[PDB]
Ligand binder design. Sequence first.
Ligand code: ADP
Length: 266
Amino acid sequence: TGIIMENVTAFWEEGFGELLEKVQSFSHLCLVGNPVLKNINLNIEKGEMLAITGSTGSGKTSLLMLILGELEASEGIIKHSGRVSFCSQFSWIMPGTIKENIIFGVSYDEYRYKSVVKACQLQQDITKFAEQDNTVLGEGGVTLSGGQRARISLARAVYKDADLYLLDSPFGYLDVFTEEQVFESCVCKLMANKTRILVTSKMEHLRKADKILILHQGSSYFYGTFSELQSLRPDFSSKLMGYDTFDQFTEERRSSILTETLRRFS
Ligand SMILES: Nc1ncnc2c1ncn2[C@@H]1O[C@H](COP(=O)(O)OP(=O)(O)O)[C@@H](O)[C@H]1O
């Protein structure tokens, strides 16, 4: 499946801020009648990758909830059909082995498993443990690094057979060379033909995306190709492409540069 949004708007409604909270004054935002997103348009073909970036708290997560149906479109048309698979920014971990976490509630299939494991770069993790992917974890799997938890929860989501993959900021940790190999192997090759939406703050991901959506304040700052971006948003581009290794700054620096840049160039 592809995905289409034509001129979609969505309001704060009772309970969405708390959902937002799990997944990453609400009353007043529902009382007053307020768009969390306004005039969103995107059109994404089967098998393409949409990269979503923007300033912090611009509605990135919220756009995924709307896809998931947890937020409601008060206006506009959304089309997409099929199973969706959601990897949240929170990396949840269930009691059981690493392997049991990746296949959680889904049947085991060897070729599929081994291939997901290799492309999420889990082979370098599990090889440090005496029982490898049979190692037992407690929930939160709290002695692992953030990147280890995020790769296991990415592998779980990519292993789900679905028509659309929603991946909310997996690449936000310090082990930055691993993240680059995950993006190239999992998101770019293994998933090359699965429709997919990657929320992100690395410019390489916009560079390889089929489509790009930049959000600011609940609003679409830009939407189209990386090439259209360089030509239609030149102040944004020149500033962002003008660092020499932006993608290796910490997630917080990158997101703060993005926010400031989006603030400057509205
Ligand atoms: N944990 C939170 N507590 C209070 N307000 C929040 C929280 N998370 C997001 N918001 C607010 O809700 C709106 C939408 O946030 P969100 O969709 O999470 O943006 P983003 O994913 O781009 O960082 C923003 O206006 C933001 O300030």
